[PDB]
C-alpha cells in the first residue's frame, strides 16, 4: 500500500541520483549479520515466509536483496524486473522462488568477483504484513572462504557502510546468542559507527540455545538493558530462530518460541521485561518509529522537490520561452519529420 509507493520512490531516487546526495535523506533499515548467526531466519520470520536459499553452513546470500513487505490480497512475492508472481502459501513455489533468487544472485556477479554490490528490489506482498522496507546483506565471515573472492569480505563491509551512511537509516544488528560480544566484530563496528545510539537496534538470535547452554543471566540482562554495551540505544530485543534447522516451518518456530518464552522462568521472575521479547513487539515498535520518521522526511523532500522543479522551469522560461520540452524519443520524431520536409523542399 503506502510502503509500495515509498519503495518505488526509493528505487527511482537511486536510478535518478546514482550518488547518495539525496538518498541519504530518508529513513532506511540496514541489517548486518555474521555467518550462521540466524540473519536469514530473522528476515524470514519478519516476512513470515522462507524465500531465501538455504545451505548447510554455506553463505547462500551471494548478492544483496531489498525485501519489501507490503499489504496484498495474498501472501505472494514479486520481482521488480519480472512480473512472474510467486505464491508463498505453497511450498513448491517457495522452492522455485529460492532457486530463482539464487540464479539472479549468480547472474549479477561480475567477472573476477564472487559477491556483486548490486541490490535486487523484491516486493513481498501479504495481508497483515508490516509496512516497511528491509535490506538483506551477505553474512560477515571472520575467515575468508577459499571458494569466494579475496575482496568478498571487503565488499560486504563496504556495502554495509554505504547503507549505514544515511543519518536516518535504522541499524538492525543480528548475531548469535551463544557467542560472546567480544568474539564478534559486527557489534563493535555498530557501536563505533553510532556513538549516540539514537537509531541502533540489536537483535539476538538462538536465545533458546543460549538458555539451554546455561547462559549467565547477568550478561543477558545487561545486553537487553544496555549496561554491558557502552553504547546507549533506544532498546534491545531477543527473538528465537528455532533449533537451527534449515527445513523447519515458520509457523512451528513462531509457536514454539511463544510457548518457550511463556513457560520461561526468566520472564516470570521479572528479570527481563515482558514487552522486550517476541517478534510481534519488535516489529510493531520498528514499524511505528520508521513510519513516523518517514512522514517527517517525506514532507521536507516534497517541498524541496517542488522548489527544485520550479527552478528548472524558471531556467527553461528564461532560456527557451518560445519552445516546448520534449524527451529523447519525441525529439527523434521531430528531427525525422524535419528531415522529410527538407527532402521534399
Amino acid at each position: 500500500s503506502l510502503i509500495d509507493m515509498y519503495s518505488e520512490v526509493l528505487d527511482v531516487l537511486s536510478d535518478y541520483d546514482a550518488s547518495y546526495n539525496t538518498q541519504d535523506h530518508l529513513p532506511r533499515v540496514v541489517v548486518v549479520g555474521d555467518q550462521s548467526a540466524g540473519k536469514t531466519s530473522v528476515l524470514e520470520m519478519i516476512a513470515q515466509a522462507r524465500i531465501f536459499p538455504r545451505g548447510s553452513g554455506e553463505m547462500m546470500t551471494r548478492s544483496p536483496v531489498k525485501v519489501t513487505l507490503s499489504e496484498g490480497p495474498h501472501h505472494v512475492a514479486l520481482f521488480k524486473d519480472s512480473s512472474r508472481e510467486f505464491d508463498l502459501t505453497k511450498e513448491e513455489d517457495l522452492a522455485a522462488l529460492r532457486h530463482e533468487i539464487e540464479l539472479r544472485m549468480r547472474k549479477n556477479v561480475k567477472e573476477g568477483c564472487t559477491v556483486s554490490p548490486e541490490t535486487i528490489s523484491l516486493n513481498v506482498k501479504g495481508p497483515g504484513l508490516q509496512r516497511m522496507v528491509l535490506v538483506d546483506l551477505p553474512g560477515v565471515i571472520n575467515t575468508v572462504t577459499s571458494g569466494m573472492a579475496p575482496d568478498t569480505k571487503e565488499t560486504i563491509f563496504s556495502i554495509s557502510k554505504a547503507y549505514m551512511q544515511n543519518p536516518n537509516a535504522i541499524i538492525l544488528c543480528i548475531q548469535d546468542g551463544s557467542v560472546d560480544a567480544e568474539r564478534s566484530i559486527v557489534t563493535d563496528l555498530v557501536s563505533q559507527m553510532d556513538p549516540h545510539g539514537r537509531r541502533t537496534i540489536f537483535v539476538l538470535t538462538k536465545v533458546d540455545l543460549a538458555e539451554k547452554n546455561v547462559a549467565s543471566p547477568s550478561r543477558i540482562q545487561q545486553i537487553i538493558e544496555g549496561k554491558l554495551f557502552p553504547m546507549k540505544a533506544l532498546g534491545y530485543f531477543a527473538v528465537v530462530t528455532g533449533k537451527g534447522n534449515s527445513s523447519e516451518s515458520i509457523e512451528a518456530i513462531r509457536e514454539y518460541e511463544e510457548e518457550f518464552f511463556q513457560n520461561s522462568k526468566l520472564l516470570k521472575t521479572s528479570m527481563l521485561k515482558a514487552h522486550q521479547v517476541t517478534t510481534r513487539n519488535l516489529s510493531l515498535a520498528v514499524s511505528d518509529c520508521f513510519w513516523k520518521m518517514v512522514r517527517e522526511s517525506v514532507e521536507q523532500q516534497a517541498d524541496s522537490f517542488k522548489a527544485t522543479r520550479f527552478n528548472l522551469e524558471t531556467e527553461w522560461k528564461n532560456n527557451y520561452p518560445r519552445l516546448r520540452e520534449l524527451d529523447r524519443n519525441e525529439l527523434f520524431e521531430k528531427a525525422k519529420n524535419e528531415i522529410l520536409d527538407e527532402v521534399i523542399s
Binding site: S1, L2, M5, Y6, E8, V9, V12, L13, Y16, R295, V298, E299, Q301, A302, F305, K306, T308, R309, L312, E313, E315, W316, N319, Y320, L323, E325, L326, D327, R328, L331, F332, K336
Partner: protein, 50 residues
C-alpha cells in the same frame, strides 16, 4: 525510412547524438516531476488512512 527505423531501435546512438542543454533540462524535469508525483500520491494516501 530504413535508417530511421534502425536508429530508433538503438537508444544508445540517440544518447550519444542527443547532448545539449535543452535535452538535459527536459530529461531532468521529467524525472523530477515523476518523482514529485509519486511523492504526492504517497503523502496523500498516507494522510487519508487516518
Amino acid at each position: 525510412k530504413e535508417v530511421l527505423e534502425d536508429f530508433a531501435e538503438d537508444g544508445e546512438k540517440k544518447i550519444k547524438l542527443l547532448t545539449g542543454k535543452r535535452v538535459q533540462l527536459a530529461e531532468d524535469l521529467k524525472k523530477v516531476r515523476e518523482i514529485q508525483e509519486k511523492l504526492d500520491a504517497f503523502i496523500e494516501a498516507l494522510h487519508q488512512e487516518k
